[PDB]
Design a protein around this nucleic acid. Structure first.
Lengths: 98, 200
RNA sequence: AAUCGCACGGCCUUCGUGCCGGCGACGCAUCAUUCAAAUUUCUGCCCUAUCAACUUUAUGGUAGGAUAGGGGCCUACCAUGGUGGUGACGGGUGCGGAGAAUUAGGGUUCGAUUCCGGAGAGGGAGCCUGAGAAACGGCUACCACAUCCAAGGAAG
RNA sequence: AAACUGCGAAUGGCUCAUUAAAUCAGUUAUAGUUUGUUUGAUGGACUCGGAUAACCGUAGUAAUUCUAGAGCUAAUACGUGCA
């Protein structure tokens, strides 16, 4: 889990729109030497917003390993523009229908 | 079809849903080969073939026309007669001479029109002789009420569109004719297949 | 013109290695084609003529395209047609054949559940997949109608 | 023994609504055409790599139906050199 110093590459992101979903993507990164973060993650999370109580974020999928570098992780939204922003609204598109 | 006909030899009691086992017990051959196969079709002149302390049988027709097994000698078992059912003509002299069993032959061998028959062994897939459909030769009749009879061809009448009827001399009793499709040649002066009791 | 699953051998050869080798089932390609397909034709298939003139690629000549393959099937151009007092075109009808029932025979009647062929899966068109579907147990999706709902959306 | 690929789910079943029609029957035509699989024919053991489901780890509209960010992995399904 626990940090010293790291950051995101947003890959593409995407939405189901009649609903209350747009889908937010990174791999969290730090690479080279050493370690998984707070600061960069927080920035992305906060500018993701304008929120109050317990954010609209839920972070909790960090699995990296003991073994190896790839974790990605990435974190959650009700929704958010930054969350639309690598890849804007599909999924309602998939249910437009085909 | 192979199943029906082996199953025909059985008709005392107690197979059919069990059927599958006879074939698996690899004790059945068709034309000297292994097939264990439930949807298999067989037809006239096929040689079918049982164990080990065993026997051989020929698919023939009974007087009505259904296909049935008849006991066959080992000597005869070696050979089979194939009627030339169709031709796509050519090369060099090759027609592609289709036969009744569904066998291809491309090429010589010295002759050859539909309704002629080829005498073939079994192991090599060699053609010993050709039995011409012509007067003076003997034939067996493959279907109908008229089925299961033999005769010598007295004359053939040809018309437009197809060669209509084959006339027979014979009978122990009297003369009869059938369309060519019915006629399966079995013997010539040089080589016969005929040693099977008789007949209207 | 453009691999599995059993082997076993011979050889330089101890297991070492080189290439091959006895069957049993792959497996793809249509290159004539078998059980198991389709499309066409000379014929006949209810009653009503208080239904008597019909039909506008719908008919014909010719060239493409299309398709597994036939073609006004689809499409250009040219020709204006082809059909019907032997019933065309049209209307109604409390599947068609194999057959059922009668009645001495003739006919009448019946045509169906079964066998056979065709067709449709709430109504209608289109499509993917697959050798083969224009698909009851697939989709797409308008409409018709029930359903689920943490009532956003799914759902038959 | 769960998924992927091959064969199958189109056969079969049942109902005559549509339905007088080359619809169906019976006879032919079909080189004017298809037939995979099979029965049958014709052709034919060098070296190899590639990623993937199950399993996993969490999830969104979320109770959802449903499937994906995602670790890991196997292909006579694939791509090749070729007498």
């Amino acid at each position: 889990k626990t940090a010293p110093a790291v950051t995101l590459r947003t890959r593409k992101f995407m939405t189901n729109r009649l609903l209350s979903r747009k889908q937010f993507v990174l791999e969290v990164l730090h690479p080279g030497r050493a370690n998984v973060s707070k600061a960069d993650l927080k920035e992305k999370l906060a500018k993701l917003y304008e929120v109050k109580d317990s954010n609209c974020i839920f972070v909790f999928k960090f699995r990296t390993h003991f073994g190896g570098g790839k974790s990605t992780g990435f974190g959650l939204i009700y929704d958010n523009l930054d969350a639309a922003k690598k890849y804007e609204p599909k999924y309602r598109l998939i249910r437009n229908g085909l | 079809p192979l199943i029906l006909i082996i199953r025909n030899r059985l008709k005392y009691a107690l197979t059919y849903r069990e059927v599958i086992s006879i074939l698996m017990q690899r004790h059945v051959l068709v034309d000297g080969k292994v097939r264990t196969d439930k949807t298999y079709p067989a037809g006239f002149m096929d040689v079918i073939s049982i164990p080990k302390t065993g026997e051989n049988y020929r698919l023939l027709y009974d007087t009505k026309g259904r296909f049935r097994l008849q006991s066959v000698k080992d000597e005869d078992a070696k050979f089979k007669l194939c009627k030339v059912r169709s031709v796509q003509f050519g090369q060099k002299g090759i027609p592609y001479l289709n036969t009744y069993d569904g066998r291809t032959i491309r090429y010589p061998d010295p002759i050859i029109k539909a309704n002629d028959t080829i005498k073939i062994d079994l192991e090599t897939n060699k053609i010993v002789d050709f039995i011409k459909f012509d007067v003076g030769n003997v034939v067996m009749v493959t279907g109908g009420r008229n089925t299961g009879r033999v005769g010598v061809i007295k004359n053939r009448e040809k018309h437009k569109g197809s060669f209509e009827t084959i006339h027979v001399e014979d009978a122990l009793g009297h003369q009869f004719a059938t369309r060519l499709g019915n006629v399966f040649t079995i013997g010539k002066g040089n080589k016969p297949w005929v040693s099977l009791p008789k007949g209207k």
